[PDB]
Subunit: 59 residues, 2 copies
């Protein structure tokens, strides 16, 4: 029931709680296509993780 | 909602409720590894989608 840190907001985490998708094709069109979320906001963190992938992932 | 209609059992869709991951490496090891679900049941259906991917997708 603790589906918050992995719900619609995780993709907005403080950039330091993701699973760093670590995709070699990370991109603002590939990650979201691979099942990850592209940050870009913080280049010091993973710009490709599995935050609120629920978008169309869990679907 | 109770992530169920999009979780377990979902990956067992009737073969016409997926989002056709449309992966270039669709396989029962790559998709389920990339964040998709490999069917193989029907060749006319997507043997790679995002059913109950929530497993290690949403996370």
């Amino acid at each position: 029931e603790e589906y918050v840190g992995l719900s619609a907001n995780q993709c907005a985490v403080p950039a330091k709680d993701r699973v760093d998708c670590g995709y070699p094709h990370v991109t603002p069109k590939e990650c979201n296509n691979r099942g990850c979320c592209f940050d870009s906001r913080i280049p010091g963190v993973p710009w490709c993780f599995k935050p609120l992938q629920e978008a169309e992932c869990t679907f």
